[PDB]
Amino acid sequence: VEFVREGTQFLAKCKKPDLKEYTKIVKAVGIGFIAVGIIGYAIKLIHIPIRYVIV
Amino acid sequence: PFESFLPEVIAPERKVPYNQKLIWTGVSLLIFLILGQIPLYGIVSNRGTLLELGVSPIITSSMIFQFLQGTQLLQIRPESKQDRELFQIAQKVCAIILILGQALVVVMTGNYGAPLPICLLLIFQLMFASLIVMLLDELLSKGYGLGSGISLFTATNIAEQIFWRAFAPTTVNSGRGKEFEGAVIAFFHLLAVRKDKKRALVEAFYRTNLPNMFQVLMTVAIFLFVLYLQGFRYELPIRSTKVRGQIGIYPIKLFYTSNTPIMLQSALTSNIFLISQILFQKYPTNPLIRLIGVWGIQMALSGLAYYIQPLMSLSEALLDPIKTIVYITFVLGSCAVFSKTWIEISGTSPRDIAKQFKDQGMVINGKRETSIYRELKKIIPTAAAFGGATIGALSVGSDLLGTLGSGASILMATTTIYGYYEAAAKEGGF
Amino acid sequence: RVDPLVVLFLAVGFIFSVVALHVISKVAGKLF
Amino acid sequence: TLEYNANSKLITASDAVVALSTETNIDQINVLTTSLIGETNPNFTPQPNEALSKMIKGLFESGMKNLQQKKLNEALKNVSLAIEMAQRKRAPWEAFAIQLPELHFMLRSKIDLCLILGKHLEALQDLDFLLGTGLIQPDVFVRKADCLLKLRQWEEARATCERGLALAPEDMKLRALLIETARNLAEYNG
Amino acid sequence: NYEYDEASETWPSFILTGLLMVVGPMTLLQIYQFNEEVFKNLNEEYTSDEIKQFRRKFNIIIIVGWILVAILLQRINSNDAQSTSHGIALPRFLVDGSASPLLVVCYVALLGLILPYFVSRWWARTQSYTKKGIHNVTASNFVSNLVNYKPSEIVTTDLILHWLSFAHEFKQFFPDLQPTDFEKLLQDHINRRDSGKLNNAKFRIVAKCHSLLHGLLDIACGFRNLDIALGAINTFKCIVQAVPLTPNCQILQLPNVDKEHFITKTGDIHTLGKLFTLEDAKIGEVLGIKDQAKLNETLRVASHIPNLKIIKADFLVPGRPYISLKVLVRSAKQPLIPTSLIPEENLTEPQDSESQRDPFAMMSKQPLVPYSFAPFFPTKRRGSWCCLVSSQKDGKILQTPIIIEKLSYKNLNDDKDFFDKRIKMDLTKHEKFDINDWEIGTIKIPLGQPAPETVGDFFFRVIVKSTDYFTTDLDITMNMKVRD
Amino acid sequence: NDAHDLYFQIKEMSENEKIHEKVLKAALLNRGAESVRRSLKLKELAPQINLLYKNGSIGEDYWKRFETEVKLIELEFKDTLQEAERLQPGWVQLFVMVCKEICFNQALSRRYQSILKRKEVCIKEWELKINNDGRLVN
């Protein structure tokens, strides 16, 4: 049980992020992630009918 | 040591700005993605397309050479600018021959056919695909790209899977009618054409057979939670001694191990599951083989492999509480000890950081010089163990609530993108 | 030794060569 | 093209239009070959000449003697003739460390005489040359700032006075010149 | 193998979702969606007509998405409509109709031409251009002209114009002209002359000369050469104001003055203060304009150009040393206030952790500078300030010049016109004089070099030159006393 | 922008025009002087060019052009020294010093000759009116 106490005391000394920084973090990460995802999805969608027509 | 003249991309003599780096990342990703959808010619998942081999042989080359470095059999000496080039050219020369061997294996054994020019063309296609993938990784790593190539490709695959499991167009028609495999597509279709809203919402909400909307909300929730729990870090004040007036801070983040121990744990559990299944397949029943696990419908029953099985929903969670109470603690302790072992082996020990402070001359603001290692022993190990335990807890939560993707994959993708953003913000750019 | 545009041009030439090979095989099987 | 003279043995350019670089190099080759015709020894040494220095010193002393006679008009002509001779009739391969300080020393007396006589622009230009060659001392800055205030350039006067005071801060006349240029410039603006 | 939708029963829903997931957030975001500048009005009233003709010469997605959504909803609601059977939501004619090879040909084109062509064009365009913002041939020519530059020739304005007429970015704009023509054009602009037919080329080259002069200044500061940098700043003033560089130029930069009268009648006035020492009618009597409705205009232009003045300047030694200045931006009319009346509260700095971390942050907060009064520069310019430092032992520049933009011109407002110099009644003891009103700017320059390890005196000299007017600037020799 | 080809031109002229022997030696010494001046200039300008190049404001091709010039100057000087040795036997141990002196000496000579032209720029730019005897008459 002492391990949990040490961990709690450690997080107590941690630096919790504020909202004005949180919004920039979430914006940057979400934009990057959605960009990668949409690129992957579009490149996986376009190539089905073309792989039908060619082959 | 030897001499060789091989293809390699050159590094820029100056630092490349942000916009060109971003454009090169985008175009390299696009080429790697197009390369993986176009199938081969001579034959009659990324299986059966131009990207059969993938980057896995490159991962194996890097892994075996990292292990050879860690075991101290090459006598690494950073004091010379020649052993680095020798190791780098050894990487390439062994990767090429191992890739050639894997290609020969898959062409002479795979499902393409035993019956010569066709086999030559089939080996040449795979050779050229793997070579271009290697060149592209090298280009992205030399400096033109934001970060590594392998991690970017992995994040790409994870994000693409998460989307396709949400906005799928492929309709599945089994007796009752055409049903969508996407989430939002299914919701909008059953809202528009069914015209029975009170039943349509509940029918499109659960869908025990195909992805639904509740899973999408849950995965958005876990994504936001992970993005919140990422900025946590321990900051302590540091000051320099060689030149005065330099005050600084050394951040100690929470996810210190950076997704390695969860990967090791998943790999070892998958491997032991495969071995147990194969041995249960070879021998039908035996004392030890029946005691370690009794496979059924494939999930083992009354076995240790059955005990280490993940929990898919709250149903099996409330079914046998002892399995959960052993499995959760097992996975948590495993991730914790793996975090400790990794911070011990990877040269990130408090001793190495104290030595680095001795070299750079950095010291704490309001503390002496003989206690840096003593203080680091009280900050680093607890941080690593707690990071491992938290990764384990989030993985358990994701596997239990059953989102569109496993928690490990979302964690890896989010961490890689966060590292990209952190580098971009520390450097300073759009 | 090689420039980035070299890598891009090689990759595009390769992909287009494979696609041309497929379409040639298909049109040959369809015509004769 | 370019014609080779017959009896003078100096190269002359016959073209109609030429840039400045070719003209300078042609003049330098002219003076070099004119010196080589004069010097008869095959293995020449950088050791300076003697009779040339003798006549130079003679002209310089004959010019300086006019100050004791209080003749302020011909002394400048005499020192100028001595400087012109020491600049013309000394071949370039002669020692640097003995052609530089002699010129500097003679130009110093010329500067002082020209500043006292009443000619100002010439004195300021000579001072700027002497300061560009690499001699930076409060025996130059005070005279330069004096000439600047004399021919009415105030901002550069303050600039030079401050550069001087930042190289001999214990000076007594640089501060007076600084105060005077400050008053003049405050009148110039206000 | 899939089964494509044959009777148009599933692609409507898919396209409708693809439209909604784009329209929704856009509609949501659309629904959710200091420093007095008194020259912005008088600038456009005196600029000639040709410049105006030049400067004039050189959301529907939401609505269309919503109407298409309406069409799709009407079309879907108007329709009448064991082993598993897969089916892809795209229609059938896209692969089975008479338009089968058109798609593959379009894709082969989009992969074989449009991608490599555009990427190669963009790469070649962003490879050549230097970081400062100029071509490579121009930078090469500037360096090759500073390298073999004899220190004998005194830098003038003509020499820098002759260096600028050899630029390369002037050749692409007009591949038919020659450099001597560019020189003649730039001269015709400086001396307020008409080109006749090449006006729309002269305005192009003059509007482009700005970044070129900044590049030349940066390279000249690089080579540790001071004369060419100072000449570059003077020529930049010269072009922006379109007036030849002379002794009495501060008074010829005014809007409407006649040289052929001023040069001949008076010969003792050389600067603004010497002008404002005169009375109100004597100004017009000397300038020779004789028009009150316009005399007020020229006085309004001549009572607003910023002259600087120092208050306190010294070194500071953080982890990296940086210079700090205390300038007091004054107009050409207000008399001298003693430095003693400064309450000393404005000068002092707050000592906080956030301030100690990034000291230049407190400077980065100040407002911006107004639009300059450039009735002959074709475009519109914000006033600028270029402050460059030079050493005092030998006389060479020792860092790139720092170009500051933010300075509080508040002290020039027409509200405190009671503080005039012609009253000479000791106006500091006035009911309107409130020392708490005069705002004291702040300029901070990093030293750009590590401190000397020796112990002794080290002299420096900081210049702050203006770049749009012919105003008064700063020339001080500050010293650092290293003591350890 | 050099006097390098000038020695070759004078040599080709002397090959048939019967030019005296001292003019050849003078042109040779002058070419050596220009070579020494350029060597010193490049040796002193290398650091600031390197700094600007690392700052990324000079491009890339100019660094290679500079590096080529560094050794091309030395090649030209060695060719000149060999030509000198061919022109007179045992005349190389003195030639280098004679050149090292003429370079600096004629540099000073040009800097001093420049003032007669430099003087009128000040008059034109400050609008002075100087009568005879160099005094001011406002």
UniProtKB/Swiss-Prot annotation, chain A:
GO terms for molecular function: protein transmembrane transporter activity; structural molecule activity. Residues 51-55 are extracellular. It comes from the Eukaryota. The keyword Signal does not apply. It is found in: Endoplasmic reticulum membrane. It is a single-pass membrane protein. Keywords: Endoplasmic reticulum, Membrane, Protein transport, Translocation, Transmembrane, Transmembrane helix, Transport. Component of the heterotrimeric Sec61 complex, which is composed of SSH1, SBH1 and SSS1. Presumably three to four Sec61 heterotrimers assemble into an oligomeric ring with a central aqueous pore. In cotranslational ER import, the pore diameter varies from 9-15 A in a ribosome-free resting state to 40-60 A in a functional state when associated with the ribosome. The Sec61 complex is part of a channel-forming translocon complex whose composition seem to change dependent upon different functional states. Belongs to the SecE/SEC61-gamma family. This is Protein transport protein SSS1. The gene is SSS1.
Curated annotation (Swiss-Prot), chain B:
The keyword Membrane applies. Pfam families: Plug_translocon, SecY. Keywords: Endoplasmic reticulum, Membrane, Protein transport, Translocation, Transmembrane, Transmembrane helix, Transport. Changing R244 to D/G/P/Q/Y: Severe growth defect. InterPro entries: SecY/SEC61-alpha, SecY_CS, SecY_dom_sf, Translocon_Sec61/SecY_plug_dom. GO terms for molecular function: peptide transmembrane transporter activity; protein transmembrane transporter activity; protein-transporting ATPase activity; ribosome binding; signal sequence binding. GO terms for cellular component: endoplasmic reticulum; rough endoplasmic reticulum membrane; Sec61 translocon complex; translocon complex. It comes from the Eukaryota. The keyword NAD does not apply. Residues 194-209, 281-323, 397-399 are lumenal. PROSITE patterns: SECY_1, SECY_2. SUPFAM superfamilies: Preprotein translocase SecY subunit. The chain crosses the membrane at residues 22-44, 49-68, 93-114, 116-136, 182-193, 210-229, 260-280, 324-343, 379-396, 400-421. GO terms for biological process: ERAD pathway; misfolded protein transport; post-translational protein targeting to membrane, translocation; retrograde protein transport, ER to cytosol; SRP-dependent cotranslational protein targeting to membrane, translocation. It is found in: Endoplasmic reticulum membrane. Belongs to the SecY/SEC61-alpha family. Present with 24800 molecules/cell in log phase SD medium. This is Protein transport protein SEC61. The gene is SEC61.
From Swiss-Prot, chain C:
Its main location: endoplasmic reticulum. Keywords: Endoplasmic reticulum, Membrane, Protein transport, Translocation, Transmembrane, Transmembrane helix, Transport. It comes from the Eukaryota. It is found in: Endoplasmic reticulum membrane. GO terms for molecular function: guanyl-nucleotide exchange factor activity; protein transmembrane transporter activity. The chain crosses the membrane at residues 4-24. The keyword Transport applies. This is Protein transport protein SBH1. It comes from Saccharomyces cerevisiae (strain ATCC 204508 / S288c). The lineage of its organism: Eukaryota, Fungi, Dikarya, Ascomycota, Saccharomycotina.
From Swiss-Prot, chain E:
The lineage of its organism: Eukaryota, Fungi, Dikarya, Ascomycota, Saccharomycotina. GO terms for cellular component: endoplasmic reticulum; mitochondrion; nuclear inner membrane; rough endoplasmic reticulum membrane; Sec62/Sec63 complex; translocon complex. It comes from Saccharomyces cerevisiae (strain ATCC 204508 / S288c). Changing P306L: Temperature-sensitive. This is Protein translocation protein SEC63. PROSITE patterns: DNAJ_1 (PS00636), DNAJ_2 (PS50076). InterPro entries: DnaJ_domain, DnaJ_domain_CS, Ig_E-set, J_dom_sf, Sec63-dom. GO terms for molecular function: protein transmembrane transporter activity. CDD domains: DnaJ. The modification Phosphoserine is found at S384. The keyword Ribosomal protein does not apply. PANTHER family: SEC63 DOMAIN-CONTAINING, TRANSLOCATION PROTEIN SEC63 HOMOLOG. The gene is SEC63. Disulfide bonds: none annotated. Present with 17700 molecules/cell in log phase SD medium.
